[PDB]
Amino acid sequence: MGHHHHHHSHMLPKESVQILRDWLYEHRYNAYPSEQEKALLSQQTHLSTLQVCNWFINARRRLLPDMLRKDGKDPNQFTISRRGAKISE
Template identity: 45%
Template sequence: ACREIEQSLQDLTGASLEEGMGATMSEDEDEGPPMIMEAAPMDMSSNGHDMMGFGPLVPTDTERSLMERVRQELKIELKQGFKSRIGDVREEILRKRRAGKLPGDTTTILKQWWQEHAKWPYPTEDDKAKLVEETGLQLKQINNWFINQRKRNWHNNSQTSTLKSKRKRCS
């Protein structure tokens, strides 16, 4: 079982366990009674217990460099694996930042139509098709612009007409 773990670690990191840990079990050590290996000096916990599950484990410099190398390799692999998705998300964020205001020349065309049809600001399908050609916008953008414009315009008109009617009552 230990050899399988060692092999998996070597396949993953490209380093043998000897390089990373300093000591490992070898085939020679399988024979005979288990031996206690010397390890790096152990930290003692606040109550004086050793590393037999009671105190913190401090990695050696070699272990730290191996862990850092593995971290960097994983980071590179993840970046490569998710590169296209990261690009898609970045593009979507930039697109949403750009969204919001239409170019001035297109709003001029839409406002002109609005003023010409102020009594009934609902463009027909033919009107919308013509506006799509003139502005280069999508039909959905045209529809949304008119919806928003009616809300803005009618909201302002309803406030001013309400004020006028209140003034008339007070006079």
């Protein structure tokens, strides 16, 4: 009873992004890696801890830079933009 599946990155639903983004936006400072944040977001969202944790690392690494540069109250920790995003055609 094998299960057909494919390995490829994908973005989470808009509803999950809004709730996940709202938490990060409200807690941009203490956005640093933490089990309490990952566990709290995991219970709030219908995604697994691994999905939220991996998404948090990527989303945070692409969201903090924009908010930190836009504000400028504490710019640090990987200031990279939205992870490349220089492709366009």
